[PDB]
Structures are given as structure tokens and as C-alpha cells.
Design a protein around this ligand. Sequence first.
Ligand SMILES: [Zn+2]
Ligand SMILES: [Zn+2]
Ligand SMILES: [Zn+2]
Ligand SMILES: [Zn+2]
Lengths: 126, 126, 126, 126
Amino acid sequence: DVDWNMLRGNATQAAAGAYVPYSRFAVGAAALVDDGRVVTGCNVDNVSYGLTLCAECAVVCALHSTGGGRLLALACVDGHGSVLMPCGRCRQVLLEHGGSELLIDHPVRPRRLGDLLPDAFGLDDL
Amino acid sequence: DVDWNMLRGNATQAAAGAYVPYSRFAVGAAALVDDGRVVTGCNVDNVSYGLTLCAECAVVCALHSTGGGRLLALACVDGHGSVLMPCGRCRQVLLEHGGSELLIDHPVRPRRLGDLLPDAFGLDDL
Amino acid sequence: DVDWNMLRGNATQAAAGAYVPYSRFAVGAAALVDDGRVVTGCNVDNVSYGLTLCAECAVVCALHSTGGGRLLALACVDGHGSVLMPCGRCRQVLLEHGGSELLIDHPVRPRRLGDLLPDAFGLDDL
Amino acid sequence: DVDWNMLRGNATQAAAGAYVPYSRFAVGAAALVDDGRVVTGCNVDNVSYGLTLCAECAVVCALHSTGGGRLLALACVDGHGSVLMPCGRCRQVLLEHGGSELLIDHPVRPRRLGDLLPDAFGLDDL
Ligand SMILES: [Zn+2]
Ligand SMILES: [Zn+2]
Ligand SMILES: [Zn+2]
Ligand SMILES: [Zn+2]
């Protein structure tokens, strides 16, 4: 079992660091890596809104700054600690680093990433 | 009721315009708008690869340059005319402009975008 | 000489099509292509703000949907017709399609893109 | 007053973490924060190339995961340790967090970000 309480808690803590002067919408994420460490991320607004960095992308950056590996589970929350589903961009980028079986926290029942992004674009297409 | 042969054909034609010096992976897309017009897009490489524009995003730019509206159906194909599933980013972008019932071409049977991006991040989360 | 009045006017018209329910910040752009046609673009918000498409990127999509070519001059304006400098992302993407000598409209004196993005990242680095 | 040898070295070390199966172009970056700590980042390819994360953006994610603050100096290098100029997107992102006086390493003499992104798009435009 994944310690979802621990991941959700770490995601919430991460959200406190969000840089959101324009969106005012803090987001945090935390992921369990296959070596057992946890990496975290928060969103980062830009004045050109289309250059905004998602919390889940920040998690992926942290993954490869701290030794690499594969993601096993991820929780994403807003500033109030409510669980959020990743945006489509983040689903694709998370898939690169945890695949279809990466588990994504959900208010009712955590979901396989493969269910959140079925028939995904990928290597087979290139 | 959607002429998929027509949409797929226009997507194929669109792919011929692809700017792909670095990726060498041409993609074209075409979508039926709710006023009955068809809009098209192709991918555009950048030397900083993360600034690459997807065909499906190009379709959405075209949508709003030609009078706006809602997308009803989209086909995306590679340089060989083979049907591609949109990347996660494009699934999120297309959802904004066609919603869950937007149909996405597929080699077997076209799919609702809602099935390709379930429990999507959205307005309720902000 | 570039007909800046004409480009600025076309950029302003393009801004009217902006999809900006979240940012409320309409942007339009228009560019002269080296075959003499003008292509236009507007910005497109997404609920995931980081998937927002810039007007200038939309111009580049239009370029390669309408026969390709090179950009000679570009004007970008807000919803009030005031001239805007492109964001850094757009400077890089415009550079791919017009190079250092692409002229960018400015309230006082249009500027070479090479001056707006000096010592640019590019092919030499790859 | 900035130890460029130290920053360049940490950037080089950061590049070793790069996730670059598709681009094969490793990039690392390191920045001095105004509390005196150093944060690092590396690039991260995605199979949809337009979702690639730049090293410099990874630095900004790290900044806000480690207490926030302002960037004073940044070095960016390739896999061979050669100094790279940031792409336009990254120039805009870095400007948000270090402003015009943020120093950017360069093979000849480090440059003010204000000189690398003059007349930048910003808060005044919104
Ligand atoms: Zn996201
Ligand atoms: Zn895409
Ligand atoms: Zn822009
Ligand atoms: Zn960059």
C-alpha cells in the first residue's frame, strides 16, 4: 500500500511554497520514487501565463535533480489541501517517468495514470 | 454524421505543411467546427524543443482566428496519414474548446474526448 | 518600408478573436510573410494557465497552415490596440521563422528581433 | 563577487542528471539565491517534445521548493560543460525570479538578464 496520508501531507506542505501572484491558485505535489524517497513540487506563475510551471512538472524536475528513477505514486493538492487531478500536460509528462501504473491520488479512490490518460501518445508513434 | 474520411484527408493535407527540421515527425490535424467549417493545423518544431507547437494546438489557434466557436470532431495524423492520439497537453487544450463530447478520430472507432481525458482538471478546481 | 499601420490594424482586428475568459487580456498579432501575405493570430487561454497559447505562436501556426515561408515583420497589440513586446518564449519561436532581422513593432521605433533576443540559443548549440 | 567557477561546476554536475533519451542534449543549470544557497536543474525530454522542461525552469521549480527568494546569478551548461545562453522562454521565466540584474554566465563575460531580454514583456502590460 502507498501511504497516501503521507504523500498528501507532503503535497500540502509543498503548496505553501507556490509562486502564484497572478493566478492566486497554489498547487503542491509530492511523489514516491522507486528508491523510497519522496520528491515535491509547487506551481510557479509567470507574467506570460503560458510559461506557468505546474507542480507535477516541478516534481519531475526534482526527480532528475535528486538521482533520477521512476515515480510510483503521486498526490496533487490545492492550497486548501483538496486533491486535484493533474492537467493533461502533466498526465503526459508523468507518464514518461512512471508509466501507466503510476498511481495518482483521488478524493475517493487513487487511479492508475493509464486510466487517466488512456491510449496515450508515445514512443510507438515516433 | 461526421465525415471522418474528409477530416482525416484534411488532416493529412495539413501535415504536409509541418515545420519539422529537428523532430522529422510531421503531424497534421483538422477539426469540424459547430458552424460547419473545417480548420486545420500542423506541428512546428523549435530549436528549443519545449517550445514546439502541436498540430492540435494550431487547430485551436485557427479556430479563434476564423470566428471562434466550438469543436465537434477532430482527426490527427502523422506524415504517413496514420491516425494519432493527441498528447495529454493537447487533450487539455482541446477540452477547453470542444468539451467531453468532442470526438477524436481513432483507427478502430472515434472516441469521446471525455474518455481520453477522464476526470479532467477544470473550472471547478479554480 | 513596412506598412506598420496596416500590420498594427490587422493585429488589432485579430485581438478581437482572443479567447481570454480567465486572463481577460486579449492579444492580437499580425505578420508580413516574404511572399507578401499577412497572417494573424490571437491568444488562447486554458484553464491550466500554463497551456495558454500566445498570439505570436498562433501567427507561426498560421504561417505553416498557409504555405510556409519566412516572417519579415510582426506587430503585437493588446485589446486596446497598444503595441506589446513579445514574451521571451515568443521571441525564440519567432526567431525560428524570421531570424535576427525580423522586425517587431514598437510604440516608438520598430526593433530587429536580434536586438530583442541577442546571443540567442540555437542550432550552433545543438 | 559571484563565484562563477563554483556555479559553472554545479551546473555541469546538474547536467549529468538530464533526462534526454530523445534529444540527446543534456543541459544543467545552477543559480545563486539571495540567501546564499545554490539551486540546480537539468532538462527533461518528453515524447511529445513540446512538453520538454528546460534546466533553467527546473532551477526555478527548485527555488520555490527550497524556500523561495530571488535569483542573483545563474550558469547554464551543456553535457560537455560549455556555457549556453538560455532560450527565450527561460529568459522570461528567469526574469520573474531575478529581474533585469540577474547575471547570466557567458564564455566571455557574464551578462545582465536585462541585456539578454530588453524591453521585456511584463506586469505593466497586463
Ligand atoms: Zn499541469
Ligand atoms: Zn500535443
Ligand atoms: Zn508570448
Ligand atoms: Zn529554455
